[PDB]
Amino acid sequence: GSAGLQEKERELEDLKDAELKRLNEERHDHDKREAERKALEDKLADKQEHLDGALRY
């Protein structure tokens, strides 16, 4: 700006505010998605077959 402090701050505090605002709400769902997806593979493999299939969680 006039003092050039803006170019020094680089809006670091502004960016940090968004970090806690997002809180990885998207990434969170992504991980949870892959979690069940991986479990589905074991269900297809049938190593123990401890799932009746009636409830299916």
């Binding site: 680089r10 670091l12 960016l15 806690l20 990885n24 990434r27 991980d31 892959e34």
Partner: protein, 80 residues
């Protein structure tokens, strides 16, 4: 620093492998995993090559793996 003190937000080491032993995917690359963690989008996160970083304020630094069967994994970096 090649080690971390806290969560590894200030970690700018040359480690490019996950705790699983998989080579991290380049942050400037969209292969094999597509993401929005563009180095030019987050220049204050020091996203260089495929080095393990912590640009989301996570527990430990992480990166995308070279395995399409696993989106991302945490890296194994020693503490100071």
């Amino acid at each position: 620093e090649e080690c971390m003190h806290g969560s590894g937000e200030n970690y700018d080491g040359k480690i490019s492998k996950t705790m699983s032993g998989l080579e991290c995917q380049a942050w400037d690359s969209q292969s094999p995993h597509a993401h929005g963690y563009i180095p030019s989008k987050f220049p204050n996160k020091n996203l260089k090559k495929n080095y393990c970083r912590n640009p989301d304020r996570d527990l430990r630094p992480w990166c995308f793996t070279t395995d399409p069967n696993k989106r991302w994994e945490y890296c194994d970096i020693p503490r100071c």
